[PDB]
Structures are given as C-alpha cells and as structure tokens.
Amino acid sequence: APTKVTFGDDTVIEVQGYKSVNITFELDERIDKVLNEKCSAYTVELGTEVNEFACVVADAVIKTLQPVSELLTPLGIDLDEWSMATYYLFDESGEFKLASHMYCSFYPPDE
Amino acid sequence: APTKVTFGDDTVIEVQGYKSVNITFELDERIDKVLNEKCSAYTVELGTEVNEFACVVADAVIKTLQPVSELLTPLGIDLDEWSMATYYLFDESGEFKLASHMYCSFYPPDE
C-alpha cells in the first residue's frame, strides 16, 4: 500500500518504495545466458519477502521459455517439470534476504 | 504516470502528486445537502484539467443519486437529463483552476 504524505495546505502525495533487483540465473548453465537477458530485470517493493518474490521470478522464467518450448526438449529441459521446481533466491554472500544482486538456482545456497 | 526517483544504490521510489479537493454543490439547492455529504471529497492529480475533472464529478453525482432515483421524481428531478447535462467547476473566485474548495453548478460563475 502506498504511503500517503500530507503537507498541510491542500496537496497530498503518495509514495511507494521499490528496489531494483538484478538476478544472475544459474538454473541450467546452458540457457542461463538467455535468462540473464530476457527475465533478469526486476523491481520489487521494500516490504516484500524472498519467499514470495521467488514466485514472480518463477512465473517469469517459464513465461520467457514457454514460446520456445520445442527448442528446449533437445536440450533435455522440461518446462512442465520446471514449472513445479523450487526456485531459490539468496544474497550475493548466500542468504535468503533481499538484495541488489541475487542468484536463482534449484539448490540451496551451499552451507 | 508516477515519477520514478532513483536514489543511487538500488532503491527506486515512485512519487505521484495529488490534491485534496472538496466541492460545495450548487446543483439543485434541495439535494445539495446530501451531495455535499456523500460525493464532495475527491483526490485529483496536480496536472488534471478541470474540464476532465468535471466528468468524474458528473459520474459521481449520478451514481450517488441513481439508487434513490425514484425519490427524485416527486421532487421534480430526472436523472436522464442530469445524466446528459453539463457540469461546471470553478474556483472560489470564479476561476477554472483547481483548488481545495470548488463549486459545482449547471451555470458558469457569473460574468
């Protein structure tokens, strides 16, 4: 919800805070170069959690690859199987917290 | 369109200016009481013109009176004429410039 700020008089503005998040994809090591081009730019609200931001990134990867579904099957990639995978998003140092540069992978951020 | 403010780092904020407008009605001088109570509070963008503002106040007046349209016919009010009538909005001094307090009437602000 945008925060309404009244300055007295008669004028009222409402602001919303976002953060420009750039994601480097490590999903398949092959089609990652095209994911870092077509669905690598995001802008998320400050109050959002990573568990819910991983969903819009998930929907964007499939919507990016769905038109070219038939050129993925020779590579062994199944969008139906990819549609239900667990997309993890962690910091540049490796932690499930929002940040500028984040990594996307099917596996947790190591240990 | 909300103006985007890049503060460096990765934080982007969207700012949109609005203006609190309350309109004292001069439409019928019998139902002007119930109009000043249920559709006299608006929040308009700083750049909106009055001729376009008159269209949302017009719809808000008819949509306020439509659920009780059958009680307006004994008073001599027909929405089908109000639905197609022309609504003027002017400053406290009779100018076509937005302000906190404006008037609404079927006639221009005198001469």
Swiss-Prot record, chains A, B:
Q: Which domain of life is it from?
A: Viruses
Residue stretches in coiled coil: none
Q: Which reaction does it catalyse?
A: Thiol-dependent hydrolysis of ester, thioester, amide, peptide and isopeptide bonds formed by the C-terminal Gly of ubiquitin (a 76-residue protein attached to proteins as an intracellular targeting signal)
**Localization (cell):** Host endoplasmic reticulum membrane
Q: Where does the Ubiquitin-like domain start and stop, copy by copy? A: 3-111
* Regulation acting on activity, per entry: Inhibited in vitro by GRL-0617.
Query: What is the topology of this protein in the membrane according to its UniProt annotation?
Result: Multi-pass membrane protein
| Self-association and partners | May form homohexamers. Interacts with N protein.
Record function comment: Responsible for the cleavages located at the N-terminus of the replicase polyprotein. Participates together with nsp4 in the assembly of virally-induced cytoplasmic double-membrane vesicles necessary for viral replication. Antagonizes innate immune induction of type I interferon by blocking the phosphorylation, dimerization and subsequent nuclear translocation of host IRF3. Also prevents host NF-kappa-B signaling. In addition, PL-PRO possesses a deubiquitinating/deISGylating activity and processes both 'Lys-48'- and 'Lys-63'-linked polyubiquitin chains from cellular substrates.
Know the name of this protein?
A: Papain-like protease nsp3
Q: Which organism is it from?
A: Severe acute respiratory syndrome coronavirus 2
Q: What is the lineage of its organism?
A: Viruses, Riboviria, Orthornavirae, Pisuviricota, Pisoniviricetes
Which gene holds the coding sequence for this protein? Answer: rep
> Entire protein: which part is shown?
819 to 929 of 7096
